[PDB]
C-alpha cells in the first residue's frame, strides 16, 4: 500500500558574478542535498523495509535524477534560472560563463518550464521521485521484483491522484511519466559534468558527493 499523502509528507518534510560561482555552488548544493535525500527516502513507504544493500543500490543509482527533479521543481518560480539549494540563482549568462550553458538550456526547456506550464504540484513531484527511487533496472538488487512492485504501487496511486484531482486532464498522468526520459538524459549530462569537475579539482574532496562518484 502506497498513499500519496505519505509521499507528499516526505516532500514537505525536507523541502521548504564570478564564472566560478555556479560550479562551486553546484558542488556544495549537491552534497548538501544528498544528506537530505536519505531522510526523504526513509520517509517513502516501504523503502526502509528493503534490505540495506538494496537501499544503497537504489540511492546510488537514483540520487542524481532525484536531486535534478527537486531543483527543477523548486525553480518554477525563478525567472529564466535555477534555484540551487545553496540559495544561489544560476541564470543563463553565468551558466554559460561557467561551462554548463547547454545543460542549463535543456533543464529549463525540458524540465522547469514544462513543470511550470502544467503546474506540477508537490504530490506529483514526490510520486515521480518515488518512481525513480524504486528503479527496478538498478544493477545488483537482491529482488528486482519487490522494487518493481513498489514502483507499480507508486504510479497506481499517482494516476488515481491525478484523475481525482485534475479530472479535466485525462492525459496528465501520461504527461508526468513522459518527463522521465528527459530526466534520464539530463541526469547523464549533469553526471558527466561532475566527473569533469572531479578530474580538474573543482569538487571538494572527502564528501558524500565524492563517495557517490567513487563508489
Amino acid at each position: 500500500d502506497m498513499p500519496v499523502e505519505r509521499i507528499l509528507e516526505a516532500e514537505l518534510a525536507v523541502e521548504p558574478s564570478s564564472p566560478n560561482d555556479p560550479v562551486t555552488n553546484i558542488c556544495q548544493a549537491a552534497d548538501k542535498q544528498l544528506f537530505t535525500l536519505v531522510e526523504w527516502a526513509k520517509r517513502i513507504p516501504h523503502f526502509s523495509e528493503l534490505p540495506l544493500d538494496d537501499q544503497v543500490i537504489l540511492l546510488r543509482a537514483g540520487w542524481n535524477e532525484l536531486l535534478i527533479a527537486s531543483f527543477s521543481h523548486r525553480s518554477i518560480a525563478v525567472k529564466d534560472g535555477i534555484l540551487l539549494a545553496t540559495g544561489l540563482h544560476v541564470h543563463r549568462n553565468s551558466a554559460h560563463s561557467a561551462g554548463v550553458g547547454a545543460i542549463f538550456d535543456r533543464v529549463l526547456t525540458e524540465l522547469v518550464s514544462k513543470m511550470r506550464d502544467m503546474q506540477m504540484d508537490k504530490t506529483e513531484l514526490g510520486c515521480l521521485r518515488a518512481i525513480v527511487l524504486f528503479n527496478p533496472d538498478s544493477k545488483g538488487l537482491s529482488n528486482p521484483a519487490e522494487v518493481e512492485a513498489l514502483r507499480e504501487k507508486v504510479y497506481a496511486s499517482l494516476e488515481a491522484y491525478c484523475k481525482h484531482k485534475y479530472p479535466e486532464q485525462p492525459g496528465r498522468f501520461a504527461k508526468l511519466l513522459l518527463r522521465l526520459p528527459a530526466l534520464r538524459s539530463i541526469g547523464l549530462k549533469c553526471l558527466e559534468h561532475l566527473f569533469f569537475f572531479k578530474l580538474i579539482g573543482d569538487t571538494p574532496i572527502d564528501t558524500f558527493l565524492m563517495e557517490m562518484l567513487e563508489a
Binding site: 544528506f35 526502509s48 540495506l52 544503497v56 567513487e214
Partner: peptide, 11 residues
C-alpha cells in the same frame, strides 16, 4: 571504504 551512505541509512 565509502560507507557514508550505509551509516546514514542505519540511523
Amino acid at each position: 571504504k565509502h560507507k557514508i551512505l550505509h551509516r546514514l541509512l542505519q540511523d
